[PDB]
Amino acid sequence: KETAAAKFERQHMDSSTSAASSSNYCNQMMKSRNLTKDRCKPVNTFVHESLADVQAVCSQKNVACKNGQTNCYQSYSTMSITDCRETGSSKYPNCAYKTTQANKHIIVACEGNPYVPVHFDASV
């Protein structure tokens, strides 16, 4: 079955674009990435950087995760990201999202060998 690392790539990586281009980015992406198949996932963040740059965060600033875990890491530099948040008109199976572009540091939880990102914790 799908690995935590692969799931991270599917849910959060979008290296083929530098930023969200229209207000429909989240609607398309949430659907295409299969994140709205069983229910409308409330929030999600896509990262517009090379996979290599994001995997490299696992060797950057170690910080505690929101939940208290200590296997989180914060990127030294800001990254281009798109925040997807469910709209008031979102109704399964027709999930709807507001697209917000931003540039911030990201915090991911890392696991395994090779030590890679398996969870997107927050953007600061």
From Swiss-Prot:
Keyword hit for Glycoprotein: yes
Q: In which tissues is it expressed?
A: Pancreas.
- Any one GO cellular component localisation term in the record: extracellular region
- Quote the subcellular location field of this record: Secreted
Arranged from A to Z, the UniProt key words for this protein are: Disulfide bond, Endonuclease, Glycation, Glycoprotein, Hydrolase, Lyase, Nuclease, Secreted, Signal
Report the record's Gene Ontology biological process terms. defense response to Gram-positive bacterium
State the Gene Ontology terms under molecular function: lyase activity; nucleic acid binding; ribonuclease A activity; RNA nuclease activity
Disulphide bonds in the chain:
C26-C84, C40-C95, C58-C110, C65-C72
Q: What is its EC number?
A: 4.6.1.18
| Record-listed substrate binding positions | K7, R10, K41, P42, V43, N44, T45, K66, R85
On the tree of life, the source organism's domain of life is Eukaryota
Result of altering H12A = Loss of activity
Give me the glycosylation sites of this protein. K1, K7, N34, K37, K41
Complexes and interactors: Interacts with and forms tight 1:1 complexes with RNH1. Dimerization of two such complexes may occur. Interaction with RNH1 inhibits this protein. Monomer.
Similarity-based family? Belongs to the pancreatic ribonuclease family.
By what name is this protein known? Ribonuclease pancreatic
Q: What is the species listed in this Swiss-Prot or TrEMBL entry? A: Bos taurus (Bovine)
Please state which portion of the whole protein this structure contains, as first and last residue out of the total length. Answer: 27 to 150 of 150
